[PDB]
Design a protein around this ligand. Structure first.
Ligand code: M1P
Ligand code: M1P
Ligand code: CL
Ligand code: CL
Ligand code: CL
Ligand code: CL
Lengths: 899, 902
């Protein structure tokens, strides 16, 4: 029995939720409170790597640690009882068929745990959410209801175990750092403000304060406190069976008590209460992180006063509804439409958690990587576009003059940090892809001619050597001969990122793997490894760049490109061409370029004919396409055929026939298809090979087939068990990209199969054991792993919107090109998407009254708010017609399909 | 109800032991298995920072984590039951007055947990120990007994949760590293050998293997296994209530199964068994760490075959009995005598754990520090003296030519490691301890030639006591000081000692006392490197210089030695021999030290001067006399209330730390101890110090505090003051310093005062209601009276040494045996005797003091001494008389005490 959606806004319910290991749900705000909550109220609460309110956890902690959030009721005639079932007594009923009835319900963005004590006649409902205010705070409301025939006498105790320091102290100096604790009680609760912090930052004064406060529903303060963990649990006790609750002790402390040197717990004893039959009492608990001592009075008024929890919960619901209403799908698959709303949430979660601080994500420290800078723009372009232009510009400051980039992202806009060395060969590919998407959604072609600096640190020639001339006095920006900061166009940056890899070839003529590509686990072939997979991506990028430049001339009238003089060496088609068949000549020309720009550029720029640069780019792209088709197209003895993706550190071809089974990678196929290196015939054959070697009937499209044992000339990924992480799991991000590539090329039935498999696997709860959303991967047992924060959600959202429903920009104009299959249309012959375009909410409704399959339909007519529209692949609508619409409301655009 | 000793070899029992938080007991061998076991079988098992078999823990884990060692019985008519009480059902009885009867018993070196299920009529007894074999292994034997009227039907399951990787992975990449697990089942159990290790060493291939194996008493293998943790516990389960046990599921795996990518548990299902009334069945479980895949057949034969557990347990008992029989006390306080056997164990534990890998000691990675090199020699001198000479020689290789030393200790004998990237603290006290330890060796052994052995000096990028980085250093020079012609410089051990003590003499702050540098003994006084001063250790260096002077003159008187071979550059520091500087001038002392540093950096000339041993002695005595007068005249302070004592410190603002202050007088114990021990304090000053200590430091509940309360953090002095008052180095009863205080008192003849101090340590430690610890001396007694950081503390070495050499007064003087009892009347037993068995000059002596007149200390003298039934001349016995005794046996030495005349 999996979860079931309730209503039409994505709310779900799961019965007996704690009968599933490892479940958790995210609660977060922009202010920076980051929490996870499990069905028994375990998880974690933090504002950062150094400021955990609750103990840092990984997945095994969710069952193995007793320190959940808790709320206790000492019931007369029964004794101690946890509202979430986390007591030794209640846990002892697991697997005996005597378990209490329980449920989780959740929505955007809140979580509710219910439990029933049939013996005592008591029901509890505990609602958790992070308010969308400017405070780092999580709220909990516990409502107790008497379901029996006679009055119940109850003594309530909230208990939030506190940690209140860096994850660095989890074990290392865990005890020593407890001696630094200072606990302060006041009318509404408990503050912990360690005197000092001891962690990897060193030994420093601390002012950060962690608070647990509470009140009855009417605002009445707690009767008293047990702020010291060892006194709360008692001698030989534990947090799932604490003496203070179990023996119903009188409180240890009242308001104004200070205690030093002990682990703390936010244990708030409320007044005993007599609850009438059928009636309820409620309690609100607040968990707070602040930069200094907390103004507890203000927090009590804002969060604990009567009615504040309920008003703030409504405000949370309206804020999240508003964020997620920017993309809505409506089809014949009602369940998948609602599942997609959870997918739509995920890119926001990734931003707000910094890919960290959820139980599986046990290594992240909340930062951003280079890839995140570009990937975060995908969801924002369709959900919240105002910020994207400034983000893209800032990102290009990270590029070095050798096409590589900074890999540590700083605090400020366009701030990058030099490393106290690894190059990922794919890092140069993603920016053009993201930037092109922006250009097509916005029509803002002038972005390309904005000025920007280049990043500079000790590492030169793509981190192959240290610059001898470097000091602290150079700074973090590339300098000219005359000592000025060099600035080049965004387009110059883009050109550099794509043309440098073209020349950076290995002994088999494909682009070097360097420290890894997209697959972070292919890290053991920096000397001789090659990523054929991303050679296809760079080949495609160069071709798109050529087309872009010619379209810039055709649309803008622009005839020249301002480029650093030294870059002319790499555009050899304009001067003395080299042979692209010669590895030696390509490498030598690249070395000449590196020499010309290290340590400084001249600062002089050449103006080059935009058509002649385009011709140089097309020559590069054509050479690469021909080389991949002629040299890297492989076949097994059985007769399946596909593209080799890799060479290993011994210069050996990775893919093809092998002892113990054929070796194939999904990554080696995706960009060949997406970018056009693969012909239509090759693409059909690749899809057959993928289905034959990679498509598992239990777990879907694997990232790779099985390589037996560790592969120390290729990557650490192969030390993972087969079916997990980057070793042969269904890795959602790559599988979505595969589907995207198929749809792009017109392989719609094949693309549909891929996307539908991701949904079906994710939603098959008996195996996946996850809440609605797309996980990072589906593993060898069919379990969903590393939930919520995966970049796959961005790609899934984008693919559904821009490929499947086919609502996308073309140089700022709106293009409609549906790739919906017949089964996707609802009972009235309709499928619809609501989406933001050119600053307006559109509801694009596709009508298929003849019930034609994809390939048998075309666009017959388009109407916009009840007037007929002109339509210039598919149908194209000028941007001015969208912009002339009113700002408020959803404007209906009806596309009628016929045979 | 605390623990109670049983029998006369130190075994104890504690009833309802899990009614106490944070208790644990150590099990360890020389092979390198290091474990801790709690009353519910929690703790940890490891061979090192990177090779934990069970999950790394700290103190809070002992209650908060469900992952104890466990052994389960599914009892027909009752259900799942843990032999240690660690089940959700059993834990739910805590605080309800319905708890099962339980107990811990332990001895040297083994642990037993007992429990009774009165409802089912079942009793269990689980014995844990680490065999004394060459394997890294812990054994467990569970014995189940039917105490009821009818047959019991039982299904047993052992369950040792596995971790099997570095403590670095505890959370950071915890899940990712589980994907590297490879589990292999075989007839007798489960092996986990991760394919790779990801930790602070990097990403590497792994071969280390972690095993859990088992058998019935008669040798029968397990019926099957549940090797995968999530399958053992079940969906929504936990290790204290696992579905495989609770629902009595059939095993997941048999011998020959391999599973990859999952957290593992050594869950061994045994055959169901019908147990008759009054009868027992037993099971043996083995937990193994090995450098490669385990020869499971050999381990089964060696550890699981019938009778092996019991034979190995007897071998463990005999090995530990043998180690601890080297020192035995016998007095009127029988309980304290047995408590002292546990104290006697502690220095061994500190060596074998490397001060790490017990739950409170949650930061250690198993290494040794500079202090440990010298401190480990104290216990060895009394317990295993054969090793000490070579250890001392090796240790001196760590000294730099500026008197400082290496602070990272390597694998090999006399191996020290440079850290070139990270700027290293200097601890100002590090130069003081070696002479103290070495003098003890010289007096126990009589081996004065040690002083003239050659040894190198340590050399790395850091020069002038880590004040500067040397531009001229390279990797090809090596880690040893070089001469002008590129040869490795060697100087005598004595040269090393001189250097360590004379350099600090000149290294003075603005108030004329020796600089604090990065800290002294108190590691928490780390925030005054620029202007801080340790007056406390200035007294120690003053005393060292005086003892050195006396030592050199005694070398001449005893050996005939007239000269000392010393590096030419060191003559600058012995200024009394050339052009004397004024020791009253800070500027001149600092300038002379800078000249010395310049003369020896980057290299020495290699040339040596021969100096008159009397003239060097005169220079040393002049230094010591100057320091004694300066401390007495400038650092003796008084409160307005009228107490007086020595100021111990200046802070980083150049302010005197101790004395009157708003919110209360500031005083440190450390500032008193070495002044007393070394003679800077006169007898009159010592009496007054003792009064000030009792006034300002002696707490009625927790004993002699390390310092009085300074309100709030002290960012110009040390991070210690961020600790709550009464914990760690902020005002706790810190055993190591308090023992040293007692030692100092006894040394100076303040015997009643000394006795009070030592007795307070024992009484606090053994007052279980507050201390909540097993027998032994903890690192500290805290604000609530709790014993903290058990077993591994250096205080045990000092307590052992003080009891032997000061209290019973059995000690060497240049290799001859000196007997000087400082026992009080209350210490004599019912027959008027107090005795100590101890090794001296390679012979076991039982020194028996008879006080038939029941005289108090101060009212008695030595009336006669007999040795193996013959009269002895003198109180001081020549080493030849001890050496002429037979090698085997304990030789009785009877010292008869009588009253004074007048
Ligand atoms: O965002 P996801 O789904 O978790 O993907 C992660 O792993 C990818 C493959 O190594 C990487 O390419 C990504 O950068 C990321 O680390
Ligand atoms: O051996 P013990 O009793 O645990 O003492 C420890 O703390 C002392 C004071 O900081 C140090 O001086 C010791 O070196 C040691 O780190
Ligand atoms: Cl019950
Ligand atoms: Cl990070
Ligand atoms: Cl019961
Ligand atoms: Cl260490």
């Amino acid at each position: 029995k999996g979860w079931k959606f309730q209503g039409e806004q994505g709310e779900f319910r799961l019965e007996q939720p704690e009968h599933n290991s490892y479940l958790y749900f995210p609660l977060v705000n922009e202010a920076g409170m980051m929490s996870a909550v499990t069905p028994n109220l375990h998880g974690e609460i933090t504002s950062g790597h150094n400021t955990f309110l609750m103990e840092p956890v990984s997945a095994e902690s969710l069952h193995n640690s007793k320190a959940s959030r808790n709320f206790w009721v000492f019931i007369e005639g029964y004794g101690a009882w946890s509202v979430s079932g986390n007591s030794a007594r209640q846990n002892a009923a697991r697997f005996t068929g005597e378990e209490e009835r329980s449920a989780v319900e959740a929505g955007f963005l809140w979580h509710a745990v219910t439990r029933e004590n049939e013996k005592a006649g008591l029901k509890a409902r505990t609602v958790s959410f992070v308010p969308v205010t400017d405070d780092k705070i999580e709220l909990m409301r516990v409502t107790l209801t008497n379901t029996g025939n006679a009055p119940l006498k109850l003594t309530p105790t909230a208990a939030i175990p506190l940690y209140g320091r860096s994850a660095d102290d989890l074990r290392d100096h865990r005890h020593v750092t407890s001696l630094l604790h200072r606990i302060f009680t006041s009318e509404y609760g408990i503050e912990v403000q360690p005197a000092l912090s001891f962690d990897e930052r060193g030994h420093r004064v601390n002012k950060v304060t962690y608070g647990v406060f509470g009140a009855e529903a009417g605002g009445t303060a707690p009767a008293g406190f047990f702020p010291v963990t060892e006194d709360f649990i008692g001698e030989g006790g534990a947090l799932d069976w604490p003496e203070a609750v179990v023996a119903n002790r009188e409180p240890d402390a009242q308001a104004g008590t200070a205690v030093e040197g002990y682990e703390a717990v936010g244990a708030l004893r409320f007044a005993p209460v007599e609850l009438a039959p059928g009636k309820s009492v409620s309690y609100v608990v607040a968990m707070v992180i602040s930069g200094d001592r907390i103004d507890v009075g203000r927090y009590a008024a804002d969060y604990l006063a009567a009615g504040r929890f309920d008003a703030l919960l409504e405000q949370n619901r309206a804020y999240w509804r508003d964020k997620l209403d920017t993309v809505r799908f409506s089809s014949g698959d009602g369940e998948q439409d609602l599942w997609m709303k959870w997918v739509t949430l995920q890119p926001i979660l990734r931003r707000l958690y910094g890919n960290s601080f959820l139980p599986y994500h046990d290594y992240g420290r909340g930062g951003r990587g280079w890839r995140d800078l570009w990937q975060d723009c995908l969801a924002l372009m369709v959900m919240e576009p105002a910020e994207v232009r400034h983000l893209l510009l800032n990102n290009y400051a990270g590029v070095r003059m050798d096409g590589s980039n900074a890999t540590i992202i700083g605090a400020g806009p366009g701030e990058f940090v030099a490393d106290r060395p690894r190059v990922w060969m794919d890092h140069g590919a993603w920016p053009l892809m993201t930037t092109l998407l922006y250009l097509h959604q916005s029509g803002d072609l002038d972005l390309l001619f904005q000025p920007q600096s280049y990043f500079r640190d000790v590492f030169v020639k793509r981190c192959r050597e240290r610059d001898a001339s470097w000091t602290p006095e150079q700074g973090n920006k590339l300098l000219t001969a005359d000592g000025q900061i060099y600035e080049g166009t965004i387009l110059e940056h883009i050109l550099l990122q794509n043309i440098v890899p073209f020349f950076n070839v290995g002994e088999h003529g494909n682009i070097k793997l360097e420290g890894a590509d997209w697959n972070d686990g292919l890290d053991l072939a920096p000397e001789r490894g090659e990523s054929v997979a991303f050679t296809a991506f760079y080949a495609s990028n160069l071709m798109e760049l050529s087309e872009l430049l010619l379209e810039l001339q055709k649309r803008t009238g622009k005839d020249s490109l301002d480029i650093a003089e030294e870059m002319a060496l790499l555009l050899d088609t304009l001067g003395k061409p080299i042979s692209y068949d010669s590895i030696q000549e390509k490498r030598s020309l690249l070395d000449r370029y590196y020499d010309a720009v290290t340590p400084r550029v001249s600062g002089k720029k050449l103006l080059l004919d935009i058509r002649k640069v385009a011709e140089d780019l097309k020559r590069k792209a054509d050479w690469a396409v021909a080389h991949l088709r002629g040299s890297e197209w492989i076949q097994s003895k059985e007769g399946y055929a596909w593209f080799n993706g890799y060479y290993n550190n011994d210069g050996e071809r990775v893919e093809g026939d092998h002892p113990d089974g054929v070796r194939m990678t999904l990554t080696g196929q995706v960009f060949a298809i997406m970018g056009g290196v693969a012909t239509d015939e090759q693409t059909e054959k690749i899809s057959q090979a993928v289905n034959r070697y990679l498509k598992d009937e239990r777990i879907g499209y694997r990232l790779n087939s099985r390589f037996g044992g560790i592969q120390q000339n290729l990557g650490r990924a192969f030390g993972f068990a087969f079916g997990h992480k980057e070793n042969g799991a269904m890795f959602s991000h790559m599988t979505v990209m595969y589907a995207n590539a198929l749809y792009k090329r017109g392989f719609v039935q094949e693309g549909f199969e891929v996307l539908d498999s991701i949904y079906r696997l994710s939603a098959d709860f008996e195996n996946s054991r996850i809440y609605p959303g797309v996980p990072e991967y589906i593993n060898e047992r069919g379990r969903g792993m590393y939930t919520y924060l995966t970049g796959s959600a961005s790609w899934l959202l984008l693919t559904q919107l821009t490929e499947v429903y086919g609502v996308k920009g073309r140089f700022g104009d709106l293009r409609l090109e549906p790739k919906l299959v017949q089964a996707q249309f609802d009972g009235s012959g309709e499928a619809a998407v609501e989406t933001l375009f050119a600053g307006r909410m559109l509801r694009v409704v596709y009508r298929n009254p003849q019930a034609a399959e994809h390939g048998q339909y075309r666009v017959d007519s388009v109407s916009l708010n009840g007037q007929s529209v002109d339509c210039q692949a598919g149908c194209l609508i000028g941007r001015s017609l969208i912009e002339a619409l009113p700002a408020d409301g959803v404007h209906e655009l009806i596309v009628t399909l016929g045979r």
